[model samples]
Target: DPEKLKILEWIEGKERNIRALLSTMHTVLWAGETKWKPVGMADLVTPEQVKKVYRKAVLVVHPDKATGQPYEQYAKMIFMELNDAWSEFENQGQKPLY
Candidate 1:
């Protein structure tokens, strides 16, 4: 039972680290949205889900919507991150780490 408990503890630690990584990645990628908070790995989903979110976000944050160079640059950065997230999800399944 002690060994089992130790294993469970290790698993929990890994889960927390994964959550932190995903949250950091999302925040760094979508800086201004303030809506990319992920509570845990379960919050991560399929690439199709990422694509849907990307489309919705682009509609709101696209450079065309913001008419300044700085805003355009920020939006482009966000787009790049959204694409990165999608690609990562697609290549490694839904979990943050395979």
Candidate 2:
């Protein structure tokens, strides 16, 4: 299950990036402390499932949707991180956020 573990770890990092963005401000947007169950782990998640969660994740943090909010800047950072991680996943190893 080496491959499974690798994917799980990678996804966990991406999820962590999302959480860290808001957690620093005492604003907990995406909860559950490191166990991103909504997105699932590698062994249990299908691409479709991951995609679904990613879509939802971005919508919540997307800067465009954060209009007029004081933390809108933070939202932009989170959205970019989310997309970069996703692109890395889709590309299967571009090595940007390592």
Candidate 3:
């Protein structure tokens, strides 16, 4: 049974790491708190909130707004934030587990 317990522990540790990664990615994409914004507000927001913000931001910074360097730069930054928010929400199981 010792071997079985060891395997179980390993699995649990992996799960925790995965969860942490998900959480980290989510924060990165959504502009949530990390080392820089440890006490940030986004960490307390729900997925729905993030989605709404993303939607609004996209409308303002859509890549199709204009075809030039400015558009490209803005769009890239917006898309990066969108991706981060999406990853965070997706990894959090699409909703709070609790």
Best by TM-score: 2
lDDT of each: 0.47, 0.50, 0.44
Clashing pairs in 1: none
* Candidate 2, superposed: residue stretches over 4 Å from native: 1-44, 93-98
Report the lDDT tens digits of candidate 1 across residue range 1-98: 34334434433433323333343343333336554443344444554544554555556546666567544655554454455555555565555333
Better of 2 and 3 by TM-score: 2
Candidate 2 lDDT, 1-98, residue by residue in tens: 34334434444534634333322322334332232333324422455555666776677777876788765655565667678767756775322221
- Residue runs of model 3 more than 4 Å from their true location after superposition: 1-44, 95-98
lDDT, model 3, position 96: 44
TM-score of each: 0.40, 0.53, 0.42
Summarize candidate 3's per-residue lDDT along 1-98 as a digit string, tens digits.
34334434433433433223233333322222222222223443565654555455445445675347433553455455456656656776766433
> Sorted by lDDT, highest first, which candidate order results?
2, 1, 3
Residue 98's lDDT within candidate 2 is 18
